[PDB]
């Protein structure tokens, strides 16, 4: 509350560390469904169904241009990528499997870097 603060957690490396995680997600062999925005002209149903499209290249541009206020807003966009994937793709599909794999990969790196 006013003039009452928990001890200050060092957040000065968070930007660099989120960048590193994102590089690791970009270079994973199962990243290919997620590297670029879904083409809304060429994928019927996407535009109407997926209210907030998100992809690694959009996260990278937001990250590089100071559009994440803190590391939690960064995590919320990464998770959005996978939540969108689960919304639109059957679990038993190459893309559906890719999303589950990448979400696992991300959640481990997140825990190990920050928790």
UniProtKB/Swiss-Prot annotation:
It comes from the Eukaryota. This is Bromodomain adjacent to zinc finger domain protein 2B. Belongs to the WAL family. The gene is BAZ2B. Residues 9-113 form the Bromo domain. The lineage of its organism: Eukaryota, Metazoa, Chordata, Craniata, Vertebrata. It is found in: Nucleus. Component of the BRF-1 ISWI chromatin remodeling complex, at least composed of SMARCA1 and BAZ2B, which regulates the spacing of histone octamers on the DNA template to facilitate access to DNA. Within the BRF-1 ISWI chromatin remodeling complex interacts with SMARCA1; the interaction is direct. Component of the BRF-5 ISWI chromatin remodeling complex, at least composed of SMARCA5/SNF2H and BAZ2B, which regulates the spacing of histone octamers on the DNA template to facilitate access to DNA. Regulatory subunit of the ATP-dependent BRF-1 and BRF-5 ISWI chromatin remodeling complexes, which form ordered nucleosome arrays on chromatin and facilitate access to DNA during DNA-templated processes such as DNA replication, transcription, and repair. Both complexes regulate the spacing of nucleosomes along the chromatin and have the ability to slide mononucleosomes to the center of a DNA template. The BRF-1 ISWI chromatin remodeling complex has a lower ATP hydrolysis rate than the BRF-5 ISWI chromatin remodeling complex. Expressed at varying levels in several tissues, whereas a smaller transcript was expressed specifically in testis.
